[PDB]
Amino acid sequence: IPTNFTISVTTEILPVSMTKTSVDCTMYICGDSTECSNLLLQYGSFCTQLNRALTGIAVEQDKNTQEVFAQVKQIYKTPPIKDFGGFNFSQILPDPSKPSKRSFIEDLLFNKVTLAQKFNGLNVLPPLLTDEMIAQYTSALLAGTITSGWTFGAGPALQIPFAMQMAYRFNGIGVTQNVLYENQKLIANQFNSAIGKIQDSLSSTPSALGKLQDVVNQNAQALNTLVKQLSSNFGAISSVLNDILSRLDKPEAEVQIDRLITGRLQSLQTYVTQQLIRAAEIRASANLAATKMSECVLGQSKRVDFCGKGYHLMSFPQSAPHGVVFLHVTYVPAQEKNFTTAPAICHDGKAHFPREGVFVSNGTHWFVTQRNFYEPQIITTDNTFVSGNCDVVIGIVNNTVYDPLQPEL
Amino acid sequence: LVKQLSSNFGAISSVLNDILSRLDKPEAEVQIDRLITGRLQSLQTYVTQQLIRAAEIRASANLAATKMSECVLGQSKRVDFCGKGYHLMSFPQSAPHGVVFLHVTYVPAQEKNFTTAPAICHDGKAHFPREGVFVSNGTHWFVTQRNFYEPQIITTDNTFVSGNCDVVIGIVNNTVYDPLQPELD
Amino acid sequence: LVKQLSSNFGAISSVLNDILSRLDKPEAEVQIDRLITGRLQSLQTYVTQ
Amino acid sequence: GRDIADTTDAVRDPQTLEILDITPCSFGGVSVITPGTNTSNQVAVLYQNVNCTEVPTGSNVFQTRAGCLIGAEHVNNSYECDIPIGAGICASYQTQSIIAYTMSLGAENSVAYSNNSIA
Ligand SMILES: *[C@@H]1O[C@H](CO)[C@@H](O)[C@H](O)[C@H]1NC(C)=O
Ligand SMILES: *[C@@H]1O[C@H](CO)[C@@H](O)[C@H](O)[C@H]1NC(C)=O
Ligand SMILES: *[C@@H]1O[C@H](CO)[C@@H](O)[C@H](O)[C@H]1NC(C)=O
Ligand SMILES: *[C@@H]1O[C@H](CO)[C@@H](O)[C@H](O)[C@H]1NC(C)=O
Ligand SMILES: *[C@@H]1O[C@H](CO)[C@@H](O)[C@H](O)[C@H]1NC(C)=O
Ligand SMILES: *[C@@H]1O[C@H](CO)[C@@H](O)[C@H](O)[C@H]1NC(C)=O
Ligand SMILES: *[C@@H]1O[C@H](CO)[C@@H](O)[C@H](O)[C@H]1NC(C)=O
Ligand SMILES: *[C@@H]1O[C@H](CO)[C@@H](O)[C@H](O)[C@H]1NC(C)=O
Ligand SMILES: *[C@@H]1O[C@H](CO)[C@@H](O)[C@H](O)[C@H]1NC(C)=O
Ligand SMILES: *[C@@H]1O[C@H](CO)[C@@H](O)[C@H](O)[C@H]1NC(C)=O
Ligand SMILES: *[C@@H]1O[C@H](CO)[C@@H](O)[C@H](O)[C@H]1NC(C)=O
Ligand SMILES: *[C@@H]1O[C@H](CO)[C@@H](O)[C@H](O)[C@H]1NC(C)=O
Ligand SMILES: *[C@@H]1O[C@H](CO)[C@@H](O)[C@H](O)[C@H]1NC(C)=O
Ligand SMILES: *[C@@H]1O[C@H](CO)[C@@H](O)[C@H](O)[C@H]1NC(C)=O
C-alpha cells in the first residue's frame, strides 16, 4: 500500500481535420483547350463524381471540427480573480494580450507545426471555423471545467470552489477527501510543476506533434504528386496539350489527347480515392477525440488508460492546427510499503470484514486502511461488518475489535 | 452507374448492338474494347465507393450495437454517450435502415447559491461530510447530497474525522449533533 | 494479383517476350503499353483493397 | 524558365530578348448561396478565392476570406450558422433578402465562482 502519491500530467495528441481541398476536373485535364474539353465529355459524369466525392469530405471536415468542439451551449468566461486554491492555470487559460486570445501552450502547439502554390485547377477551401473561434470553444470548455466541474456538461453550470471540486475527483478514484485537504499545498505544487513541465516536453522531444505534422505532410504530398503527374506524358508524343494541338491535325491530335486524358483521369481518381480513405481515418480520430472531450473534459472517466496513465482526475483541452490536444491530469501512487494482511478478523466467535477498506498489520497491531493511500485507522464496528462465524473464512486471523460504545457508560 | 452506360467512351456509339450490327469483326472489336474499358472502370469505381461507404456504415452499426448494449441493457456513466444529462435508461425503436434510441436522462434544474466549506471544526477535530456537501443558508449549516438539495442536520452519522483543524484551508466552527445524547438522557 | 499476369488485356499475348519476338518495335510498343495499363490496373486494385 | 513542377512560367522575347513572366489568368470556383426555391428566388453568388476587384454590382458586395460575395448584405450582427460560407462567415435568408454575417458560437455566460459558494 502506497504512503505517498504523485500528480502528473500527460499530453495526448489527436488529429481532427484535413485540408479542405477541391478540384476543377476539367481544368486539371483540359485547361483552356476546347478540343480536349469536348473529348472529356465522352467519359460521362466522371467529372461530377469527383467533385461530389471531394465536396463530401470537404464538408465532413467541418463536421468533424464541430463534433470535437462546440460541446457547450454557452461560452463561459474565466473569473477576474483566479483563486483556485493554489492551482495555476495561466499556461492553459487564454492570454488577453495577444490578438489571437490563445493560451501560452496553444501558441507553442501552433508554432511547432509547419503548414509552390501553383493553381492548375487545384484549390483549397478555408475551414468554417476560424482559429480564433476554436480558441473560444476551447476557452469555454476550460473555464467551465475549472469553475463548474462536470455540471456544465449535464445541464446548467453550477459554481464550485476548485479545491472542493478536486475533493470530488479524488473521491471518484477511491481516495478519501482527507487526502486532498490535508495535502492541498503539495497537490497544487505538484500540479503547477507538472504543467510547467509541458513546456519543456513540447519545446524538446523534437517536433513532438508528429501526428498532426504527418496529416499535413500527407495532404501536401498528395497534392504535389497530383500536380507532377501532369508532366508524365502517358504514351502521348508530348506532355503539353498545347504542343500537341499546335503540331498535329485534328484527328491526329485527338488520338494523342485521349492518352493524356486517360492518364489524368486515373491520376484524379487515384487522388480522390486516397482522400476518401484518409478522410475515414481522420473521421475515426475525430470521433475518438470527440468521445474523449465528452468523457474526460466534461467528466472523469473510469476507463483505464483512456485518459492518461494512472487514476483519472480531470483533463484540459488545447487547440491545435488540425487537431486537439488533451492534457490529462492523473493520480499515480508512490512510496510503497509492505504490510501483512488478512481477509477477515476473528472476534467474539464472529467474522469481521472491513468496510470500504482493507485490514493490515503494523507487525504488532492491526488497522483498517483505504486503498491507494495508507492512512491507517483503528479497527472498530464503524469500519467493519459481521457475517457468520469464523470457521468458514480461509486465512482469517485473531484480533480485538474496539469500542463501539463501551467507553461511554 | 446506369447513366454511364449511355456514355460513348471514344467509340462510334454507346450502343453495343449498334456497333455489332453496323461493323464487322475487325472493326467492331475495337469499338467494343473501348466501351468495355470505360464501363469496367465505371463499375470498379462504383464498387470501390460502396466498400468505403460500407465501412462507414459498419462503424455506425458497431456504435449502435455498443450503445444498445451499454444504454439499453444497462445504465451508462459515460458522459454524453446517452444524450445530454445523467443517464437513467434508453428505449430503442426500429427504423428502415437503422435504429433510433430514445435516451432518458436526468437534468438538474432551479439551482440556488449556498455558502459552503470543505470541513467543520468541532472540539478541535476536522469533520468531513460523508457522501455529501456542507452548505449554509446564511444562519445555519446543513449537509446535503450533491445532485439535489436536501438540507439534513449535521450529525456524527453523516461525517467522519481525520485529524486537527490546523491543516484545513476553509474549515468553519460548528456543532456536530451526536445522536446518542438524547438516547443516553 | 499473380493470376492477373497470365492475361491478355486485349493483347496478343500475356508474355512480353512473345510480343517482342513476334512484332516489330512500333507494333510491340502498342501491345506492351496495353499490358502495362492492364497490369497497373491490377496493382491499383490490389493496393486499394 | 520553369516552376517547381512544370510550365515555363517565363519566356524570353525573340526580338527584344527581354524576360516576361507568365501568370495564368485569374480563376476560381463559383457557387450559389440559396434558400429553398419554395421560400425565395433570390440568391447570392460567391466567387471562390478571388479579389473584389475581379469578376467584371456595388452595395451588396462583400469581400471575405473565402472569396468575393455578391448579392448578400453584410451586417454587424451575429446568429447561429445557417448557410455556411467559410472563415467564420455564413449567410441566412430573412424577411426581404440574404444576409452575410459572422456566426455566433453561442450565448455568453459567467459562472459566479467564489472560494466559499456553491450552487
Ligand atoms: C511525498 O513526496 C514529496 C516529494 O515528492 C514530499 O515532499 C512529501 O513530503 C511526501 N509526503 C509524505 C507523506 O511523505
Ligand atoms: C502562475 O505562473 C506564472 C509563471 O510565469 C507566474 O508569473 C504567475 O504569477 C503564477 N500565478 C499564480 C497565481 O501563482
Ligand atoms: C517488499 O518486499 C520485497 C521482497 O522482495 C522487497 O523487494 C521490496 O523492496 C519490499 N518493499 C518495501 C517497501 O519494503
Ligand atoms: C507500529 O510498528 C512499530 C515498530 O515498527 C511499533 O513500535 C509500534 O508500536 C506499532 N504501532 C502501534 C500502535 O503499536
Ligand atoms: C501461506 O502459504 C504458506 C506456505 O508454507 C502456508 O504455510 C500458510 O499457512 C499460508 N497462509 C495462508 C493464509 O494461506
Ligand atoms: C483465536 O481466538 C480463539 C478463541 O476461542 C482461540 O481458540 C484461537 O486459538 C485463537 N487463534 C489464535 C491464532 O490464537
Ligand atoms: C434558513 O434561514 C433561516 C433564517 O433566515 C433559519 O431560521 C433557518 O433555520 C435556516 N434553515 C432552514 C432549513 O430553514
Ligand atoms: C476567500 O477569499 C477571501 C479573499 O477574497 C479570503 O480572505 C478568504 O480567507 C478566502 N476563504 C477561503 C475559505 O479560501
Ligand atoms: C473559530 O474559527 C477560527 C478560524 O480562524 C479559529 O481560529 C477559532 O479558534 C475558532 N473558535 C473556536 C472556539 O475554536
Ligand atoms: C530588331 O532590329 C532593329 C535593328 O534593325 C533593332 O533596333 C530592334 O531593337 C530589334 N528588335 C525589335 C523588337 O525591333
Ligand atoms: C412550400 O411551402 C408551403 C408553405 O405553406 C408548404 O405548405 C408546402 O408544402 C411547401 N412545398 C414543398 C415542396 O416544400
Ligand atoms: C485586391 O487588390 C488590391 C489592389 O490594391 C489589394 O490592395 C487588396 O489587398 C486585394 N484584396 C484581396 C482580397 O486580394
Ligand atoms: C456596421 O458595419 C459597417 C460596415 O462598413 C460599419 O461601417 C458600421 O460602422 C457598422 N455599424 C456599427 C454600429 O457597428
Ligand atoms: C446567485 O447567482 C446569481 C447568478 O449568478 C446571482 O445573480 C445572485 O446574486 C447569486 N446570489 C447569491 C446569494 O450569491
Residue numbers in the entry:
A (entry chain B): 694 to 808, 832 to 1125
B (entry chain A): 942 to 1126
C (entry chain C): 942 to 990
D (entry chain A): 546 to 601, 618 to 656, 670 to 693
Pull text from the paper:
Since the spike contains deletions in the N5 loop common for C.37 and N2, the spike has been named ΔN25. The ΔN25 variant derived from the C.37 lineage with a large 7-residue deletion in the N5 loop acquired an additional 13-residue deletion in the N2 loop. The quaternary structure of the ΔN25 spike was less stable and showed a higher fraction of monomeric S compared to the ΔN135 and Wuhan variants. The Tm50 of the ΔN25 spike was 2.5°C higher, and that of the ΔN135 spike was 2.5°C lower, as compared to the Wuhan spike. From the ΔN25 spike dataset, one stable class with one RBD-up was able to be refined into high resolution. The ΔN25 spike has a 7-residue deletion in the N5 loop typical for the C.37 lineage. As a result of this deletion and the complete loss of the N2-loop due to the large 13-residue deletion of residues 63–75, the N5-loop shifts towards the N2 and N1 loops and concomitantly, the N3-loop shifts to a position previously occupied by N5.
S is a large, trimeric glycoprotein that mediates both binding to host cell receptors and fusion of the viral and host cell membranes through its S1 and S2 subunits respectively. The S1 subunit comprises two distinct domains, an N-terminal domain (NTD) and a host cell receptor-binding domain (RBD), that are both targets of neutralizing antibodies with high neutralizing and protective potential. The NTD possesses a galectin fold with five exposed protruding loops (N1-5) and can bind to sialic acid-containing moieties on host cell membranes although this binding specificity has been lost in recent lineages and the exact function of NTD remains unclear. NTD contains a non-glycosylated immunogenic supersite centered around N1, N3, and N5 loops that is a hotspot for spike mutations, including deletions.
